[PDB]
Structures are given as C-alpha cells and as structure tokens.
Amino acid sequence: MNIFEMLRIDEGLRLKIYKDTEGYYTIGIGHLLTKSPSLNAAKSELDKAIGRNCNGVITKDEAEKLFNQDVDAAVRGILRNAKLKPVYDSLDAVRRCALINMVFQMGETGVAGFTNSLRMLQQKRWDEAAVNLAKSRWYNQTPNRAKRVITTFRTGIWDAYKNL
C-alpha cells in the first residue's frame, strides 16, 4: 500500500460533480471544487481546473491527473509548513502517509491546528496521540475514515486498510 491507494480508498472515485460529506461540490478523487452553493460556480471551477468545457463531467484520466497534483501539493505544503515539517521529518514511512491523508482532507491549516496531537506524534507517544486525535470534529463527522487514519498513526502498519 502507498499514499495513492490509501487515499483512493478513503475518497473514492466519481466522474460527475458531487457534494462533500460537507455539502461541498467535488469531483474525481476528493478534489474540492468550490465551497459556494452554485453548481454554476462549481462548473466554472471545474472547467478552469481541466482546461476544457466539461459540462460537469470528467474522464478517469483527468481524475487521476487532479489526484497527482493534489497529493504533490499536500506533501509540499507539509514541507513548507513550520509546524508540519518537523513532525513529518520525525515520522516513519507509514505514519507519514497518515499525516498526508489528514492534510489532503482538511488542509495544512486545519491540521496545523491539532497542536497537542502533533506534539505527541513527535514524541512517539502513539497511544496518547490516538486518544487526542479522536477528540475532534473531524472524528465525530467522519468516524470510519478518522479511525482508519488514527489506527495507522497508532500501529505504524497498514492493517486498517487491508480490510478495505
């Protein structure tokens, strides 16, 4: 398993504009288009993102391209972030994927706000950190996914995703 396979399990693949768990317009493999309520604003963003007239629909190909960009951006965002970088550098390869997943779902900003958990991960206090992460809107709103990510940080192995 790798970051791409992991995220593709968590996000799924939809070739038609759809709404977030959050009610937001998305397409592909969790690519948020807009937080705005118009399907029209969403369509516009889509076409801007793909460079063609899509009429709300994309190919698999286009979906993976957006996915490649999103993952690349997430990693580079971590690397540029004063709060995120040190944790990332301290982690092993599997846990690194868990942090990446959080950043992709919630943005640099949101994750960098998990101050106390970040601290604990840096310290390698796996069980404590798993308990702390769970005390969040994130976990209450998307419990199955949060629990997979949390197990990944806890164990450092890919079993949470084996099932899936």
Swiss-Prot record:
Endolysin with lysozyme activity that degrades host peptidoglycans and participates with the holin and spanin proteins in the sequential events which lead to the programmed host cell lysis releasing the mature viral particles. Once the holin has permeabilized the host cell membrane, the endolysin can reach the periplasm and break down the peptidoglycan layer. Keywords: Antimicrobial, Bacteriolytic enzyme, Cytolysis, Glycosidase, Host cell lysis by virus, Host cytoplasm, Hydrolase, Viral release from host cell. Pfam families: Phage_lysozyme. One of its GO terms (biological process) is peptidoglycan catabolic process. Optimum pH is 7.3. Changing residue 117 to I: 500-fold decrease in enzymatic activity. It comes from Enterobacteria phage T4 (Bacteriophage T4). It catalyses: Hydrolysis of (1->4)-beta-linkages between N-acetylmuramic acid and N-acetyl-D-glucosamine residues in a peptidoglycan and between N-acetyl-D-glucosamine residues in chitodextrins. The keyword rRNA processing does not apply. Changing residue 30 to F: Almost complete loss of enzymatic activity. The enzyme is destabilized by 1.5 kcal/mol. The active site is at residues 11, 20. InterPro entries: Endolysin_T4_type, Glyco_hydro_24, Lysozyme-like_dom_sf, Lysozyme_dom_sf, Phage_lysozyme-like, T4-type_lysozyme. It comes from the Viruses. It is found in: Host cytoplasm. One of its GO terms (cellular component) is host cell cytoplasm. This is Endolysin.
